[PDB]
Design a binder for this molecule. Structure first.
Ligand SMILES: *[C@@H]1O[C@H](CO)[C@@H](O[C@@H]2O[C@H](CO)[C@@H](O[C@H]3O[C@H](CO[C@@H]4O[C@H](CO)[C@@H](O)[C@H](O)[C@@H]4O)[C@@H](O)[C@@H](O[C@H]4O[C@H](CO)[C@@H](O)[C@H](O)[C@@H]4O)[C@@H]3O)[C@H](O)[C@H]2NC(C)=O)[C@H](O)[C@H]1NC(C)=O
Lengths: 81, 390
């Protein structure tokens, strides 16, 4: 994925080929691992969606399909097939 | 096939003549009909209103009937943290919505409760329709003035365009001079809009049009991106802690075509709306004159080219062909009683003339009711046709 920035926070641009894999990237705070469970993750196209993957410390995820373990990260992917 | 034939062939034809000399003469013009004016020593003329169109009418409002969405972005906050915001909320191209959604430990919040959430998506119109308001004051009427000469033949009638703001018109008729005329309308727009969907249009009510549940832009807009009421073509689904789906409705063209059942359809061409106008005109002929006084009377033989035809207006069309020499020459013609003592009836195609030898010429005449003699040419071989008008 392409790692960029959104208002100073990390921002991942995820493509279809990355469906199902842990998204790792180094940060000043160490290695950040974000988990992406987006069922509608498709090919990158004009139909993108963008939202935040919150930092989860010691809590099961609820009503979300993206979260990270060290730093809250923004995510963007396309839904085209 | 000849000059003046069109009006002769029309069932709605008025014959107008003035009771004075050099005075104005009033005529009424309607689409589909014509007027034949006649005057002593002046050529007979045919008038026909052929087109009434609005040019560059003002656009009242543009409506989006099909749109696409891109750039969906969602921002949400924890309970007790206030309303979230996105820069896109300032960008007029985006449709946004603020909602509340359950938040808690499972999604990054230290407290269970409802948090504010906001979602935006770029709105892009893919197809729109237009509502226009035609100013009666600027409708353009096209009138064709044809010299009723019966000249077979290049020889197209004089076309003139006027609006209710035009001043008196001085139309030139090649070889006859000029005829002056003024016209005034007689309506529909204080209250009806003209909706244009693709390249059809419809006459619709102002308020109905202004109440349509669709995104719009005021007429003045040339930018076309800051649509108003975007939410009319958009549905924000129930939000989740960190994201929310936004879906755009499908094209509303079919919905419009349906809502436009019974509405008066208005024809249009080259982007202009066409209507069927009604004119009242006054015309003066003091500047017109007969063509060909310089000519002399034919003294050859003519031959009736075809079968004499009866018209819907109590007249007849005699197609003759000059077989003599000495043309352009004036065609000798007279209608009399069986004894050839008195002159009866009259010509509608005044002062008939042969421009070229063996190019038949059509003549429209009005025989008196009953029996008469149509004397064409002068002897040797003068034509003496018996006619019975019923
Ligand atoms: C969130 O999760 C990510 C990824 O899951 C965190 O980064 C990861 O953190 C792991 C530890 O939590 C780290 O494991 C290490 O394993 C080896 C370290 O040795 C350990 O030491 C103890 C003490 O003796 C031993 O008992 C035992 O042997 C342990 O294994 C080690 O070999 C480190 O290795 C390599 O990491 C990458 C991945 O293989 C290699 O490419 C690289 O060359 C190193 O050699 C590993 O350090 C795990 O690998 C690490 N993964 C990363 C950084 O991608 C992240 O820190 C977490 N953050 C928070 C805040 O929770």
């Amino acid at each position: 994925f392409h790692l960029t920035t959104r208002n100073g926070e990390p921002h991942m641009i995820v493509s279809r080929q990355e469906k199902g894999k842990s998204l790792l990237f180094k940060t000043e705070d160490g290695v950040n691992m974000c988990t992406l469970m987006a069922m509608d993750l498709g090919e990158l196209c004009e139909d993108t969606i963008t939202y935040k993957c919150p930092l989860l410390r010691q809590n099961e995820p609820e009503d979300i399909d993206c979260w990270c373990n060290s730093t809250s990260t923004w995510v963007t992917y396309g839904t085209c097939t | 096939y000849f000059q003046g034939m069109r009006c002769i062939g029309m069932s709605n034809r008025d014959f107008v003549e003035g009771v004075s000399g050099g005075s104005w003469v009033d005529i009424v013009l309607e689409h589909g009909s014509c007027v034949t004016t006649m005057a002593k020593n002046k050529p007979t003329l045919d008038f026909e209103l052929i087109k009434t169109e609005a040019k560059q009418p003002a656009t009242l409002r543009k409506y989006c009937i099909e749109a696409k969405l891109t750039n969906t972005t969602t921002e949400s906050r924890c309970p007790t943290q206030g309303e979230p915001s996105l820069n896109e909320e300032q960008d007029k191209r985006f449709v946004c919505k603020h909602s509340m959604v359950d938040r808690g430990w499972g999604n990054g919040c230290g407290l269970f409760g409802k948090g504010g959430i906001v979602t935006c998506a770029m709105f892009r119109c893919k197809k729109n329709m237009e509502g226009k308001v035609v100013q009666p004051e600027n409708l353009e009427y096209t009138i064709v003035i044809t010299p009723h000469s019966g000249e077979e033949h290049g020889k197209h009638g004089k076309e003139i365009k006027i609006t209710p703001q035009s001043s008196i018109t001085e139309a030139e008729l090649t070889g006859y001079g000029t005829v002056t005329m003024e016209c005034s309308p007689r309506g529909l727009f204080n209250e009806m809009v003209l909706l244009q969907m693709e390249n059809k249009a419809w006459l619709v009510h102002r308020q109905w049009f202004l109440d349509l549940p669709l995104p719009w832009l005021p007429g003045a807009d040339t930018q076309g991106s800051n649509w108003i009421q975007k939410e009319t073509l958009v549905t924000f689904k129930n939000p989740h802690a960190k994201k929310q789906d936004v879906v755009v409705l499908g094209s509303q063209e079919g919905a419009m075509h349906t809502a436009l059942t019974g509405a008066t359809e208005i024809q249009m061409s080259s982007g202009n709306l066409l209507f069927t106008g009604h004119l009242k005109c006054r015309l003066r002929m003091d500047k017109l004159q007969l063509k060909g006084m310089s000519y002399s009377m034919c003294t050859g033989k003519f031959k009736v080219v075809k079968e004499i035809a009866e018209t819907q207006h109590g007249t007849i069309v005699i197609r003759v062909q000059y077989e003599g020499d000495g043309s352009p020459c004036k065609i000798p013609f007279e209608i009399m009683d069986l004894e050839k003592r008195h002159v009866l009836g009259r010509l509608i195609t005044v002062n008939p003339i042969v421009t070229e030898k063996d190019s038949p010429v059509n003549i429209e005449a009005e025989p008196p009711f009953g029996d008469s003699y149509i004397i064409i040419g002068v002897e040797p071989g003068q034509l003496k046709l018996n006619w019975f008008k019923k």
